[PDB]
């Protein structure tokens, strides 16, 4: 995309901590940038929309190349962050409102480095990543997500010279779902064969998808939470078409370059329904804030080893809370993501181990070694109504069959039109982000 001249781009300042030992950290003066999908797209030498509602203008965008020549994405000024997009920062806390009323629904954002010209790339192997979260106002059907993806640090600017904005304009998004709803891919409008998504007034799908590796630290609302590894072959940003995208709609979910299911550790799905929930007698009380700690263990305990284990623990009101465990007869009580856990649990659930097909923890680790961009988002799910996270999936499945039940939400929950009314004022908060060696962040 070209860059427009109507509004300066002003990312929100967000300090994080880089740590060397427990309680010995230094501030890193980073910032938050809005994903290019949420930006106004208009004519390069005017005010005329190139995209309105869920459609590209066919006169301006008869082809992707012409669209890209004629159109530009514009900046987010400071005033518009809260007023238009529902984003705000207080000290080291970042807040994202779900619906902001001209009416904005959801948000996806990235962490910029201290220069505000590149994404802050995190080399996560043999490191610990930690943050405080509040998901108390997110119920069934919503997801306040924090995760990493194998985006380029410059959003693709060096690879795709028609991308003028780079990381500064939140470009280059890709993930392990190979999404077609990304409006700008490889420096070009994804306007070919663009199709609105029914019941989604703001979104559509273009000819291409954009694939890359994804490490989900946090997919969650107050009812259920998960962390998940998604390797791809290769891991780096890859524009896809046809079978390579692994499109759900053509029966290709397991035929593409990315592991779409991922290998998940989701406490409720692993059959501990009392670990996490909205109340003081759950082990971890989702009505109150808490700290989420993630440790990425290698084979030799060094930065050069292969990724072998994703460990997790929590801190809430000064109380250390170890992760829940897998709880099925004849299955080891795993409390972390490893290749063995993935094989054993997917075996039990009858899920295809595409994680293993894509190179497993080792391949996931190669993405983490090269460095990944931090994503913070809030969203509802127009495909599957978040049932995969917090309900029975498939909805018609027996909840006593291992793998089906992922949370207590009813199978009628999560319809975007309903959650966008009922949960309009939901806000996820991510704060006090800390990064360092294992054992350094609490």
Numbering used by the authors: 20 to 120, 124 to 464
Sentences copied from the publication:
A systematic investigation performed on a range of protein crystal damage series deposited in the Protein Data Bank has established that Tyr –OH electron density loss is not generally a dominant damage pathway in protein crystals at 100 K. Full Tyr aromatic ring displacement is here proposed to account for instances of observable Tyr –OH electron density loss, with the original myrosinase data shown to be consistent with such a damage model.
Regardless of the feasibility of a radiation-induced Tyr –OH damage event within crystalline protein at 100 K, Tyr –OH density loss is in general significantly lower than for Glu and Asp carboxyl­ates for doses >1 MGy, at which de­carboxyl­ation events were reported. Prominent Tyr –OH density loss did not appear to be a widespread feature of general protein structures, a finding that is consistent with the high energetic barrier for Tyr phenolic C—O bond scission.
